[PDB]
Design a protein around this ligand. Structure first.
Ligand SMILES: C[C@]12CCC(=O)C[C@@H]1CC[C@@H]1[C@@H]2CC[C@]2(C)C(=O)CC[C@@H]12
Ligand SMILES: C[C@]12CCC(=O)C[C@@H]1CC[C@@H]1[C@@H]2CC[C@]2(C)C(=O)CC[C@@H]12
Lengths: 125, 125
């Protein structure tokens, strides 16, 4: 039974896993046949193997992930605003996406879509 | 093609029209066969008539709407975080949803979903 409380807690665990670089933890929130579309408009990754690979590469560089507003959750779906910060070669970048999660009856994430464009990628600091 | 500037402009136009109670201004942004699902999980409403009725009913109370973060836009889709404030049943209320728009080739919104739950509805008694 997908309660808003459960979906919201999952978003929190997702953000926490990214910050800790806990790959297994992240993957554990997704269903076996879950799909990840990053960014929106690209071919979705499908399956545990593909999802694990995506997050492995996405975590090569240490990330500071933070929820910037309250989580929106209703009818087996949740959306959240946040930022992802990292640095390379003394250059700071802050990406500000809006993620959309769809959950199944078992409470696992069956679909994730990260919506953000170049204007949401802020270089400099 | 849907440029990030166009999708962002439409979102801004949407928020402005709501603030001004400009019913025609709002409906003009939608395709004649567009769908509105507000809130997410409810029965989708489609077609100009249904969409106009939804907004007319919504506008029966003065609405104070404002974007709270940068608009996210990429691949014919946009998502934004905002607040809708109004006084109802003797209580100042602030609703904080995250909306998602899908655009067609003519730059019209063909699908919109407003994701917000009871925990995103803040009534001040
Ligand atoms: C691709 C991007 C955003 C673009 C970029 O420069 C790299 C960064 C890596 C981490 C990604 C993020 C998009 C949102 C993702 C997909 C999450 O929600 C968790 C990992 C996040
Ligand atoms: C239904 C609700 C939220 C709940 C309520 O009591 C009234 C208010 C009316 C305006 C609606 C808003 C939900 C989000 C909507 C649908 C928008 O994105 C523009 C009009 C907005």
């Amino acid at each position: 039974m997908n309660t808003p409380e459960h979906m919201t807690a999952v978003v929190q665990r997702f953000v926490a896993a990214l910050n800790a670089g806990d790959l297994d933890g992240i993957v554990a929130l997704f269903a076996d046949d879950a799909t990840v579309e990053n960014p929106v408009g690209s071919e979705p990754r499908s399956g545990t193997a593909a999802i694990r690979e995506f997050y492995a590469n996405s975590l090569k560089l240490p990330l500071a992930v933070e929820l910037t507003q309250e989580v929106r959750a209703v009818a087996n779906e949740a959306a959240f605003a946040f930022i992802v910060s990292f640095e390379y070669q003394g250059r700071k970048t802050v990406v500000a996406p809006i993620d959309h999660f769809r959950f199944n009856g078992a409470g696992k994430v069956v679909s994730m879509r990260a919506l953000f464009g170049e204007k949401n990628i802020h270089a400099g600091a």
